[PDB]
Amino acid sequence: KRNRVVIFISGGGSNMEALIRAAQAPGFPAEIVAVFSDKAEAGGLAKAEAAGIATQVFKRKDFASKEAHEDAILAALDVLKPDIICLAGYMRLLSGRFIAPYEGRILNIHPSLLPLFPGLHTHQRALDAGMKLAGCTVHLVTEDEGPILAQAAVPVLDGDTAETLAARVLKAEHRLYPLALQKFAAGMVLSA
Amino acid sequence: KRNRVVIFISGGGSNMEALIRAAQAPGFPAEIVAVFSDKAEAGGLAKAEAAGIATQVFKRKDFASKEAHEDAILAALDVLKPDIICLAGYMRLLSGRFIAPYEGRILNIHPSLLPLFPGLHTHQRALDAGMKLAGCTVHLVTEDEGPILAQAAVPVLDGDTAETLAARVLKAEHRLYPLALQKFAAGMVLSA
Ligand SMILES: [Cl-]
Ligand SMILES: [Cl-]
């Protein structure tokens, strides 16, 4: 029996779609049972629907408080019985209270080499620090910053912008998230 | 005409020896003209001598002040006419005054992914932060921390110690320093 995964998104769902694609393979140890979003306009939803994955939207504005919003989400999760929850560009902070029932089972991808640049603008920040490598991190989300599960590095090239660098790191995220999920559920880069 | 390089060491000279080895190749754009040490017991000296490189020791204890020590070193450098100075485990801080005549021409290797862990115990620190990649950085030394020139990353494996990790990063340093010197003088790693 494969691990049941629910992916959360708020935007275009690039990493969500990478997870859905990797999970189609024979013997992959997880299946994607739903994609949840806090935004109806999130481009990832249409992508999930086209690949035949159930989708659910819970808008914050539709509840009287953040707790009522997390409560609706938890009740909805419970009917799906996920084993693993993957955040893939979800833009809301999870309370400790939300995390508790899924302690140790919530993963997140972040486009820096944590603990560097744990907040926003990670690619510009790498360029501003003059770094020659950058990358991404999958970690557990904890009751900021649970245990790192996996990391990937790519070169920063002469002449990169935040946009060119982000696009390269994103190829790496597409490969890293499935690998971390595979490891969870079941040489060197030189830049000069 | 090749770039003339003087390497500084205080210890066994592993990276010094990597630079000396890379420079033997036809068409390599640098030659190693001397190795300087602040310690007569530095194991790198014997290695330099066996490869036919002139060596010089200036002990701090033999001068009345740090300035007189840097003064002797600068005068000695001047007779060798280096174009590039490489620090390879040299354990003394260079004053701005020492750096000025070689501004932009002094390189250093550090066994972390700067700006992470810029001081000591870099491998233990990476393990304590739970990182899955670690590596090394060649940077310019400035009148801590000049512009990064090159970086390399290697995986941190399940079960690494500071010692196993240091040894892996050291293979990467051996490859990184020559590459940075080559660039100066003239895809991705996933870990889960
Ligand atoms: Cl950015
Ligand atoms: Cl260490």
Provide the residue ranges of all domains of chain B, joining segments of one domain with +.
1-192
Q: Residue A192: list chain B partners with CB under 8 A.
A: 138, 149-150, 176, 179-180, 182-183
- Residue B132: DSSP 8-state: S
DSSP state letter for A138 = E
- Which residue among B132, B148, B172 sits closest to A188, beta carbon to beta carbon? B172
Question: Are A14 and A26 contacting, i.e. CB atoms less than 8 angstroms apart?
Answer: no
How far apart CA B21 and CA B44 sit, in angstroms, is: 13
Q: Which of B175, B154, B180 is nearest to B166 (CA)?
A: B154
Edge-to-edge order in the sheet of strand A133-140 = A55-57, A30-37, A3-9, A84-87, A106-110, A133-140, A148-155, B189-191
H helix or E strand, kind and range, residue B126: helix B122-128
Cα–Cα distance measured from residue B20 to residue B33, given in angstroms and rounded to the nearest whole number:
10
Please report the resolution in angstroms.
1.9
Q: Under 8 Å CB-to-CB from A102, ≥6 apart: which residues?
A: A77, A82, A85
Structure solved via: X-ray
The CA-CA-CA angle for residues B64, B69, B71, to 5°, reads 115
| φ and ψ at residue B87, rounded to 5 degrees | -90, 130
**Cα–Cα distance between A134 and B129 in angstroms, integer?**
17
Rounded to a whole number of angstroms, the distance from the CA of A27 to the nearest CA of chain B is 18
Helix (H) or strand (E) holding A19: helix A14-23
Peptide bond between residue B115 and the one before it cis (omega within 30 degrees of 0): yes
Cα separation, B72 vs B83, in Å, equals 18
d(CA B3, CA B82): 8
Please report how many Cα atoms fall inside a 13 Å half-sphere around the Cα of residue A28, on the Cβ side: 17
DSSP code, position B11: S
Structure tokens at B147: 């512009």
Q: Rg of the Cα trace of chain A?
A: 17
Q: How far apart are CA A1 and CA A10, in angstroms?
A: 29
Length of chain A: 192
Q: Indicate yes or no: CB of A113 within 8 angstroms of CB of B131.
A: yes
Question: Regarding the domain delimited by A1-192, which CATH topology (the fold level of the hierarchy) does it fall under?
Answer: Rossmann fold (3.40.50)
B172 vs A contacts (CB less than 8 Å)? 188, 190
The residues of A annotated as belonging to the active site are 110
Please give the torsion angle defined by the CA atoms of residues A11, A15, A19 and A22, in that order, rounded to the nearest 10 degrees: 140
CA distance B25 to chain A (A): 19
Q: Residue B113 and residue B117: Cα distance in Å, rounded?
A: 7
B141 neighbourhood in chain A, CB within 8 Å:
none
Residue numbers in the known binding site of B are 13-15, 66, 91-94, 108
SS3 A174: helix
Residues whose Cβ atom is located within 5 A of ion ligand 2: B 121, 123-124, 162
Q: Which residue of A has its CA nearest to B188?
A: A154
Rounded to an integer, what distance in angstroms lies between the CA atom of residue A109 and that of residue A88? 6
State the nearest Cα–Cα gap between B122 and chain A, in angstroms.
14
Ligand 1 centroid, distance to A65 Cα (angstroms): 31
Q: Which residues of B61-95 are buried (b: 16+ CB within 10 A; e: fewer)?
A: eeeeeeeebbeebeeebeeeebbbbbbbbbebebe
Backbone angles phi, psi at B141, to 5 degrees: -100, 130
How many Å apart are CA B18 and CA A75, to the nearest integer? Answer: 60
Give the ranges where B142-189 is alpha helix by DSSP (H).
Answer: 162-185
A125 neighbors A53 (Cβ within 8 angstroms)? no
User: How far is ligand 1, taken at its centre, from the CA of residue B157, in Å?
Assistant: 29
* Cα end-to-end span (Å), chain B: 46
Residue type, A24: Q
Cα B13 to Cα B74, B83, B86, B124, B136: the distances in Å are 21, 21, 12, 22, 16
